[PDB]
Amino acid sequence: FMVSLPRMVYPQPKVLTPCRKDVLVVTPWLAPIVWEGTFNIDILNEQFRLQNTTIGLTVFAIKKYVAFLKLFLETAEKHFMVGHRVHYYVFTDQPAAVPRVTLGTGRQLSVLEVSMRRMEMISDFCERRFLSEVDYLVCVDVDMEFRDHVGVEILTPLFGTLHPSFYGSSREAFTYERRPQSQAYIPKDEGDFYYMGAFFGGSVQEVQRLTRACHQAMMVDQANGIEAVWHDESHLNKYLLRHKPTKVLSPEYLWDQQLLGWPAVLRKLRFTAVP
16 A cells, blocks of 8 residues: 655656657656656655665675675665665675775665575575565676765566667577577577666566576576576576566666766766776
């Protein structure tokens, strides 16, 4: 059950004036593509706070990648879901190497000691835990930093993020798995977008479905002596082709400024690669 929003004063949306004319803001299956200027964060914050929403953020930091955690977590504290309940799940082979980062109120961190690892870890071993503890799961790479707002505008049953290298590419150019012998296979005449494996999520239920499907597909591939060209990203793309995401995040949400600069189409760089 959802209680009424309170009275709010904000600019009237204008039917005959789009928020953004330079980009596609809705997919052909009527999922929003999230760009700056398309959402009023005050309305969304109200909607999600009224549901006392908890967001889980999963991150793997294995071997040398533990070095990335300090900046990852500190910047997440500045920019990720601020105002909402957040539970970080840090999967690592070195629990002692996790930095002690100061968290805001209503935010907590759990250290979970540990090609297929991530999908299996999220689906296989953590299923009951997540269902009991959070409403949404967000799965990201650790070698990143937040630079701007990443908030409840992303939350939806199932989302993927446009890969920053391919958002302008024709589908024939997408680096999907192209060998029919792989479960991740996508023909040259299929594909909506190329999603990056570094940022996906949704409700706990939908995320477990996705990770379970990808893990199963990867096991089949292993048994058949094949490894998809881009590993679990290839499988993520196959899954999101056949199960359309309910929102798609623009490349604001996954950018590499060193590699790609700062095009006019991006009003904000929100979550970026560490050089």
